[PDB]
Amino acid sequence: PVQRKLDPNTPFLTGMRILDVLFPVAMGGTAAIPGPFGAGKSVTQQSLAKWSNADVVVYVGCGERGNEMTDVLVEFPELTDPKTGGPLMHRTVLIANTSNMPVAAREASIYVGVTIAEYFRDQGFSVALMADSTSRWAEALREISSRLEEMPAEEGYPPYLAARLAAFYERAGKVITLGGEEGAVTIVGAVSP
Amino acid sequence: MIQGVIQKIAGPAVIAKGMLGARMYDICKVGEEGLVGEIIRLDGDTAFVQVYEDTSGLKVGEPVVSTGLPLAVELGPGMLNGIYDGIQRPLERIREKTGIYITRGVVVHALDREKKWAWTPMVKPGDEVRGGMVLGTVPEFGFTHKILVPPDVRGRVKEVKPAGEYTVEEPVVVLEDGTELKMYHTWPVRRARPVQRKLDPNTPFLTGMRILDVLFPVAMGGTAAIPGPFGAGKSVTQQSLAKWSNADVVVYVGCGERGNEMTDVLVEFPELTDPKTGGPLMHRTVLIANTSNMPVAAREASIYVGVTIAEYFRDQGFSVALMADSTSRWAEALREISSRLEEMPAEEGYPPYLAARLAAFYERAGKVITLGGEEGAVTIVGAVSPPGGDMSEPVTQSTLRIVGAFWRLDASLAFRRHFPAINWNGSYSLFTSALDPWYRENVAEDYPELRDAISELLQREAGLQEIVQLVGPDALQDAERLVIEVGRIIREDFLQQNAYHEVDAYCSMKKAYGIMKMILAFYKEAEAAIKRGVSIDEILQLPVLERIGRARYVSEEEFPAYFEEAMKEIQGAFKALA
Amino acid sequence: ESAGELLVATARTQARGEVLEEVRRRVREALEALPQKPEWPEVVRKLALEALEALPGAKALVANPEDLPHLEALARERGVELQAEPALRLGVRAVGAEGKTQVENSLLARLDRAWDALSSKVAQALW
Amino acid sequence: IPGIRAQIRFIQQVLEQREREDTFRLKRIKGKIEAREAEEE
Amino acid sequence: KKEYTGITYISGPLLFVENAKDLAYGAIVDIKDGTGRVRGGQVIEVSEEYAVIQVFEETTGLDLATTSVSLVEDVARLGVSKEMLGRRFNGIGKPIDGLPPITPEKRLPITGLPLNPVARRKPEQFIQTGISTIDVMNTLVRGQKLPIFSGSGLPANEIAAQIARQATVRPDLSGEGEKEEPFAVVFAAMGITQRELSYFIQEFERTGALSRSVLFLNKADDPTIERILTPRMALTVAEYLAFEHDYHVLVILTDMTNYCEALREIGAAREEIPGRRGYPGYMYTDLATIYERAGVVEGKKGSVTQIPILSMPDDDRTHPIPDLTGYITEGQIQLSRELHRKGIYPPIDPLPSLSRLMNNGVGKGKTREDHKQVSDQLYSAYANGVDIRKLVAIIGEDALTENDRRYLQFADAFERFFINQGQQNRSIEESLQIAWALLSMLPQGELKRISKDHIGKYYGQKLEEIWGAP
Amino acid sequence: LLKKEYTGITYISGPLLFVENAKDLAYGAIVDIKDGTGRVRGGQVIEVSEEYAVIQVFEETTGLDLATTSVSLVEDVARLGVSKEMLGRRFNGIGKPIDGLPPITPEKRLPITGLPLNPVARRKPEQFIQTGISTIDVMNTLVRGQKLPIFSGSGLPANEIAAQIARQATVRPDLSGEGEKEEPFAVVFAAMGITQRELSYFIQEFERTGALSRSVLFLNKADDPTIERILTPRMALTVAEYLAFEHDYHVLVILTDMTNYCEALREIGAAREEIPGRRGYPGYMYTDLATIYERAGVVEGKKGSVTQIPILSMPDD
Amino acid sequence: TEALLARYRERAEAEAKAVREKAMARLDEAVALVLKEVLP
Ligand SMILES: Nc1ncnc2c1ncn2[C@@H]1O[C@H](COP(=O)(O)OP(=O)(O)OP(=O)(O)O)[C@@H](O)[C@H]1O
Ligand SMILES: Nc1ncnc2c1ncn2[C@@H]1O[C@H](COP(=O)(O)OP(=O)(O)OP(=O)(O)O)[C@@H](O)[C@H]1O
Ligand SMILES: [Mg+2]
């Protein structure tokens, strides 16, 4: 819960010129970064995590490589936080569900990450929720729907894929917390068409 | 055996109750008529049967008896000179019995059970026998047929029938175990026949065609595909191979042919002569003739029946050639069957296991050391028919991944009446490397290099055609026009063949080599002349050009002189030039 | 080239294979010679008991006629039937109450199922 | 020409996927009809 | 006959009957309602529990209380006799011409038996359709399966009726020549409208072609099962005549597209999963069992020839029905909408047309010696003419060579006098005369595909023979 | 130690077999299927309930009858007998020697499905493999712990490059210059749906250049059972992981023609009436291929490695 | 050279004979272990 949703009016400084000037995102806003393999989704989102002006960053590895999680683990401890000088990893929360870990764990991990981000929002901070692949969450939903023997809508996905995505992305926003403070959760969700 | 009764008839689907004990994919005779079918499902005390023939007239309660064996062929004396359907039914005998139509449910034995055979035994009592050994020989036209022991049999000989004339049903040999070995045995068509080893091919499958036997060779035991759009020229090449190929036995499979197209083969072949012996060609041939109106099961099983027969003749020590005409038709039959079982299509309506079946068919080819200890080979040449003429079809793509030679027939060439339509840019052969030793050791070590030279000339011609497109050939300089002229010569006088022609339908290795050396020497002399500084336009008039042109039609026995005369004329016509 | 070393290695592998096959042959011959000793009834009794334990709802027992005089008591003790059969030696098989299940305990079966690890053990012991 | 060919291939693939989905729906309705007949005749 | 009353289900075209284990699969039944009206049906599934009957027409008044079923025959059979010549039947054999029912010599199964491949003989004699584009450029040969591919608005019906009205054999050309032999036309119409029905009836009546033909006419508003049965009935009559009374029969199947659509609907009614594009997975085999019933047998002087007519759904030759027909048949005759809108009848486009067995039926002793070469030369000349015709729109006539203008005039004259013959019946001789009169417009020597003997013999005839009176 | 046989077979239909009284068959178990003729076919439990268990017969079910057929359990989870003496040997994709030498004495039996590597347990790949090919070594460098497929075409020479890397792959300890001596290197070769011609070629190359001594070959032909193609990469990677993380080996796995693997996967998926995907391929193909590929890497505190080079052929480029 | 190949062949034969000789001394122990293990 939250007292009130506000109107995003302060930029989410990504550190990337093209994004920060041509296609900005506000502090409580939502962004999608679709692209084919080799386009630069993981590099863009890790760059966001290294240089963004967010207080806390929750990186969700939803059905992606384990190398991309160990890289964060091994390198972020030795990078310096832009806004507090301390080690970068101290402001980061990692949710990892690699490609060959269980499938429904992806559905679990997206909600776990958004809940952690919402918690730190309620603490008065400004949070960035980088979701590494919503496509794998969609795939996990498709698999479970096949197990339930339901009717797929298109390409096999259950007809309620859009509702779930809407909820997940609607968790975001700059709000006045229940405690009178102000916080924001920003979601940058990658898509693997 | 398991015997039951029909519960339910719905289309070609039949459910029989009381079949507890019936095996999967066994052959059953359904109804009073005796309609044949296979078990595709088992459910408790019920077996689902697909009837090959129409089921109109069946009623509930009628009997159903299981043969107990899967679809299998009868292998033994009598296959040669035979015309069968796709499940080994002798069409000639069915005609003798039934008139012009094939009445439903007629049963006729694949091997004539009334004929005698001169049985010459080879084993003696007390001998040990293992799968594939030769119990005794039986004459069959110009071959010595070998009565092999079935692959899955063992034991020691108790009794051997003395020499004489016996029918196929006679127990020619009896084991100590009491098992009776007759002149024929049955083998499932979907089980590959075991062999002792499989070898890398090393000798060519001379098809009597210049382009194939020179630039795109196929080995004895290799696999080749011959695709092309409609009217491309694939049936005629199939038949040309069947006529002049180097194979000891030929198995020709027509899987979904048109009625009149099948009549063409059925009537033409009996007249043709065999090169080796001079007798009828049919005495070295087994024809499987399926038309588009025969049951789907027969069409599906055609290629398997053919491969099993070819494997048998391999195990006898012979070298066999199997020609599958329009394997696109077999693929369509497979698709129809899969539809009738309500399977999920993959790609263009084909089942997701089409590639597996194509592999189970083509991978059976190869040169082997048979179980008996003699070398035999099976070579497969299958034709494909892309719907739109595009090699993107699943059948063609699956074939590519397994065939060692690809013989692309191009519709553009065909519209120009360039027969064979074998596009040399798209065709390829993966045996070309491994067959060089045979050519080197049989005629000359320079044959491979002359081949590479001819190919390089073809490529150079291919490059310049872009120039010749913008401007007529005459504008090109001397060197370019010379390569264009030698390319025209090479195409029209070495790569082109007429299957119908009396003398041009066949070419030997030495003759093709001679024509290659003739053309290449002419090219070298023209190069020397252009270097000397003579006009190429003077070359166009030399009668040696006409000498090259007629080198196609010269008889085989006439060449060993025509070649020396042409070589002398090559020397003179140029040296005498100003 | 090292084809000589390859020859040596393949010869060593062949020799070790011969040793293992000799071990297998000796083991199977000894097992088949076991019923010649008076201790075979007790092992088969234990094996039948284990098989029954494997079937909580067992209904029947099967063995060769010479085995029955020793297994009738157990069948009475465990409450099941027993009929003679041309079955395998050196063990006893059962049948489930529904009748669709079976369990077999021939010593050759135990040898087959244990060879995977017995082979490693014997290879380590030998060399 | 290559562009138009790419478009043709894309449309063929999308249409074929639609056909596969319809076949799946048909198979499921046939199975459900079988279930209803088995439980109710 | 026995009567069944245990009706337990009536939905769509299907009704279920209990205790009916004596019904044979495929048996034809009669459903009598409470009012005494009788409807026909076919047993599509026989089981111990019940039998499923596909009811023709409709079930607007049936009930589970009074309805009753009965057996008509274990298998669909047609009473066939030589007296059918000159009669009109509905599609399941019922006369529609108002004359008394025929007296059967024998009742044959509709689902004919496959012909043994070894029993056939190679086609070797030609049918003269009276249409130049066919007889000359895409000859029709006895025992062939040569379809007419058409579009939505093109006149396939007119061409079919004209060929029926004009088709004949030419024994006098056969070797030393012969006087006469039997000939008949079995016309099958599937899913035709009232307008097409009236057209066919008037055309077959007003020229006497009825006396040598048998008409099966299945209307659009008639049952679909009758549509499925119509082609098989026609082919049963054709085989009877051809192979038991030595008739050369020409079978015309008016709309195979309608047949395939009805087959699709029937298959869906029987709860069968479709194949590609929604059509049944066994459409190839059904079309084969229809088409492949023509041919010529060894030892028999009769013949059966087919001219199926297929209206391509969207001009699409890749549509499944034309593709399968192309696999099974031996050529195709293509109508072109351009020639139709230009006012040319019959609008047969030579360039996409073919006849695979053309070579067999044309040559010395059958037609004329120059037939092949004349056809080849006409094809090549027309192709060059169409190309140059496109080029003129950009480059204008002046910049073209004299040969190019000659080819242009050849293309125009060909479309105007050879392709466009109208309703005039042309013997092969007149067709070849027109062909030579047109080829003469080009200079000798440009005719590379015609030997010098034929050019010397036939060249030079005045174009005015046809230009003076088209 | 005992064998238990189930004979309550109620339904055979295509690749599936239902067993009624099968409450003790675990999901994913491997079973043997014994027919009247006596021959044994392998199956797997793909669904288990209180009513019956569903078994997928690894080969076609011709010859099975409900009166005689019986199903016995092999093992709870698929396992492969691994040993350090598999080097310089040839197998068939189900783990059976095809080189004529006797079977290998197992040192361990590890599950063929493997287990996921903890992301915390990995380390970043940091060391260079010298493939001997300039473009790869200079512009597309391969690193110990990397999975770097070669996207081939219809007729391109993928097999030639695979063999060339197998011959020429080298670690090059000298340039590292960390003071240690030369380190062990091995090549595991997995061929799926390979023709007899290509099998002969691969054997010729490996045996000709002598890389066979340092190589393990898992060869699967195109006329073999379909599911033996699915198990080939898993067994190859089990041997690779064994060597790498129990004997400090540097194994280069070369999987050839993954296109064949995905085709076999489509066949097996369409066997059990599962919803299809982009072109008929199963909707779980991403997870399956990830299961095969993500088994490459270098772990923390261990000096082995697994590098994969999946060679596939792009349909119609 | 053929001499080195012959020497390797002799080495292989010696290795096989040595393997057999080493094995014979303990085969009875292995058989006893196997029998004890398999038995109930
Ligand atoms: N901003 C960048 N600067 C430099 N290199 C980049 C950049 N973005 C991407 N790359 C290059 O692209 C490669 C792939 O990028 P990235 O890891 O972001 O892929 P991705 O789009 O997430 O793809 P996938 O679907 O495989 O996960 C990176 O390894 C790097 O080589
Ligand atoms: N080698 C040749 N010599 C002479 N004529 C040839 C040759 N190849 C093709 N032709 C001509 O081209 C025609 C092509 O017919 P062919 O039966 O070979 O076709 P196809 O490619 O098998 O086609 P389809 O898919 O219709 O069966 C032949 O009838 C003949 O007219
Ligand atoms: Mg990425």
CSV table of C-alpha atoms in Angstrom, one decimal, chain A residues 149-156, chain D residues 17-18 21 24-25 28-29 32:
chain,number,residue,atom,x,y,z
A,149,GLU,CA,-4.4,-27.8,-20.1
A,150,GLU,CA,-5.8,-24.4,-20.7
A,151,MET,CA,-6.5,-22.6,-24.0
A,152,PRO,CA,-3.6,-20.5,-25.2
A,153,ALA,CA,-4.3,-17.0,-26.7
A,154,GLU,CA,-1.4,-16.4,-29.2
A,155,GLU,CA,1.8,-18.3,-29.7
A,156,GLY,CA,0.8,-20.5,-26.8
D,17,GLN,CA,1.6,-21.0,-37.1
D,18,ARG,CA,-2.1,-20.0,-37.1
D,21,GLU,CA,-2.8,-23.5,-33.4
D,24,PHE,CA,-4.3,-28.0,-31.6
D,25,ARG,CA,-7.7,-26.5,-30.7
D,28,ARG,CA,-8.5,-30.8,-27.9
D,29,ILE,CA,-12.2,-30.4,-28.8
D,32,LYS,CA,-13.2,-33.5,-25.0
